[PDB]
């Protein structure tokens with residue numbers, strides 16, 4: 042339970058992977074909205090779980106932060122850089138339209154399915170290792186997935202609002218300035234300036 | 235004989251002396267409703283305990299510093315003295331710590347006994363007391379939560395609340411702490427009152 | 433007396449006495465704190 | 475400063491207005507006995523006018539090109555005395571009035587001849603009820619939470 | 629830069645998308661939305677002779693049903709974004725970080 046001593050919503054029993062009875066706005070009241078909501082939550086969680094390592098590990102290496110690393114495009118002679126190498130197809134329009142139709146094809150291919158459980162857990166070509174063999178080891182893997190994913194969503198929104206608090210800085214830079222003097226470099230000075 | 239704030243006036247019907255400190259004092263009909271009354275008894279208790287701690291920490295250090303044992307600032311100045319951490323840091327620390335503890339207390343006010351147990355260690359719960367006076371670990375010396383004892387706490391808490399009102403108004407119109415006020419009055423009483431203050 | 437008390441609480445008389453008291457109060461207040469465009473105490 | 479206005483104490487048009495105002499009254503004081511009733515009354519209002527201008531200067535009002543003290547209501551904390559704290563005071567007093575009236579209406583709604591107690595006020599009941607307005611905010615909050623402020627069934 | 633290169637490439641890509649990617653989606657949506665109706669009948673069944681669907685030119689020999697009007701629509705989209713690309717690629721505009 043998300044808050045001990047609080048009654049659960051009726052439609053949220055606790056069988057779904059990750060259900061802790063959290064729904065203060067009662068958004069999942071109607072079941073066919075709840076199905077789509079589970080799907081969209083999993084999609085968001087997966088995107089952010091993929092993104093946050095990508096925000097952190099290049100800045101952990103000798104490259105710019107996640108927002109510096111995407112601002113060459115704001116200049117006319119924009120040329121990308123991967124690992125310190127100017128990529129050939131690096132100008133903005135090439136990048137833009139290749140990304141566009143790539144993602145559009147794969148996303149349409151995704152929402153052309155009507156299971157609706159394989160909508161969230163398709164498997165097959167997306168489960169090479171085959172961790173879906175035991176229906177309850179599978180279930181606790183599901184729980185671990187959505188748990189880590191909610192954590193990663195939290196971490197990402199934290200990253201971006203930190204960025205909006207200290208413009209032109211990276212998350213690891215924020216960790217550094219906090220470790221430099223923990224008792225003086227905290228959220229305090231951004232809440233009470 | 236449940237105590238009467240006004241000897242010639244009868245006491246309200248919703249007040250029946252069941253609650254400790256009941257003297258029939260509710261002229262404005264604030265608790266004519268049972269749920270209102272149940273919320274207000276908790277409100278009074280928590281406000282009074284905070285006021286007790288507050289004016290204790292406001293006044294006792296003042297006489298301790300004015301009889302030459304410690305050197306603490308005035309309560310209306312102690313916030314400006316700088317400490318080992320920034321002030322905003324302390325504020326957000328207190329905010330997060332208070333948010334968890336107050337939420338816990340709230341969950342027990344709304345549904346008594348629902349938050350008695352430790353959420354981390356699944357042993358070490360609390361004994362099933364009653365809302366407002368949470369026993370167990372919050373009562374190490376294990377005193378008897380007797381009715382007369384509860385009345386004493388309510389009596390003191392009300393006195394501390396009035397003392398705090400006095401402290402802040404005194405400092406606002408006078409310009410100094412409580413002990414300076416009292417010694418400067420009892421020095422020459424007939425010429426040191428509010429009349430001379432105003 | 434009882435009927436005089438009643439008549440003195442009829443709506444027009446009750447309201448004229450109420451509004452005369454209110455007028456007196458406001459008049460005296462502005463006689464002590466005149467020309468007040470704001471709340472300057474706190 | 476805010477909206478291009480300037481602190482009246484340091485403005486020039488605000489002073490010019492003060493001196494001009496004070497000037498005309500002084501003229502009214504003349505052509506009469508130096509210490510006469512009318513002359514004494516004119517003096518009194520001259521001092522009153524000087525006090526009003528100094529009070530305006532002291533309170534830190536904002537003056538435009540005409541030298542008139544403009545009022546800021548955006549919420550700037552340098553100006554809560556102009557609108558927001560008087561606004562809270564008004565809301566308190568108006569809630570007092572409305573809550574006392576509503577309390578009275580509810581209390582008299584149970585007699586057979588309730589209109590009798592509306593054209594002829596029960597002043598004892600009214601005086602018993604007037605002072606609940608003092609705590610009207612808490613009472614109204616707890617009535618809303620209870621769900622008894624707004625009539626259901628309608 | 630080479631305008632014809634870009635126009636042909638972009639409209640070819642748009643037509644490829646329309647015939648091989650979004651065809652089924654657009655077809656099922658146009659089926660579920662159906663013909664416009666007034667008072668429960670389609671416009672032709674209410675007496676409007678001009679509002680009859682052009683069933684002769686709409687039928688096609690494509691394996692999936694690609695016909696004249698949908699190549700028109702998809703190609704016009706391709707042309708629109710091709711000209712957007714051309715225009716903004718040589719407008720010489722530049723914002724500033």
Ligand code: CLA
Nearest residue numbers: 547548549550551552558562565566569611612614615618
């Ligand atoms: C129309 C747009 C708009 C709006 C809605 C606001 C609104 C606000 N502005 Mg803003 N402002 C605006 C435009 C606007 N501004 C513009 C365009 C500018 C540029 C010129 C500014 C510049 C500006 C500055 C510089 C500041 C503000 C501030 C504020 C806040 C002051 C009031 C406050 O602190 O809360 C409310 C204050 C209270 C004391 C709360 C008490 C009210 C009680 C709870 C309600 C009373 C009800 C009743 C009596 C009891 C309840 C009964 C009920 C339970 C039944 C406020 C929320 C100030 C601020 O930041 O706030 C801190 C401030 O510093 N504004």
Ligand code: CLA
Nearest residue numbers: 571572573574575576577578579595596599600601603604
């Ligand atoms: C118990 C008194 C009372 C209360 C609590 C309310 C409350 C309310 N009125 Mg209402 N009203 C009242 C009396 C009252 N009114 C009277 C006597 C009239 C005849 C002039 C009106 C005419 C009126 C209109 C035309 C409208 C409202 C509206 C409203 C609502 C919005 C606030 C407002 O704009 O009011 C406006 C207030 C007035 C127009 C004048 C108020 C009259 C005085 C101040 C109140 C009387 C108090 C009473 C005599 C005291 C007796 C106490 C007892 C001890 C003797 C609000 C819920 C508006 C609405 O519909 O909201 C959507 C609206 O359009 N009222």
Ligand SMILES: CC(/C=C/C=C(C)/C=C/[C@@]12O[C@]1(C)C[C@@H](O)CC2(C)C)=C\C=C\C=C(C)\C=C\C=C(C)\C=C\[C@@]12O[C@]1(C)C[C@@H](O)CC2(C)C
Nearest residue numbers: 259260261262264284285288291292309312395396398399
């Ligand atoms: C909580 C409180 C004060 C807390 C103070 C604290 C923590 C102080 C903390 C610090 O000092 C330290 C320790 C160290 C310092 O260096 C710094 C500060 C920060 C200064 C006061 C409450 C104070 C509460 C007060 C004064 C309440 C008054 C209520 C009244 C009078 C109500 C009466 C009635 O309600 C009844 C009973 C019946 C109704 O029907 C009628 C009416 C009349 C309404």
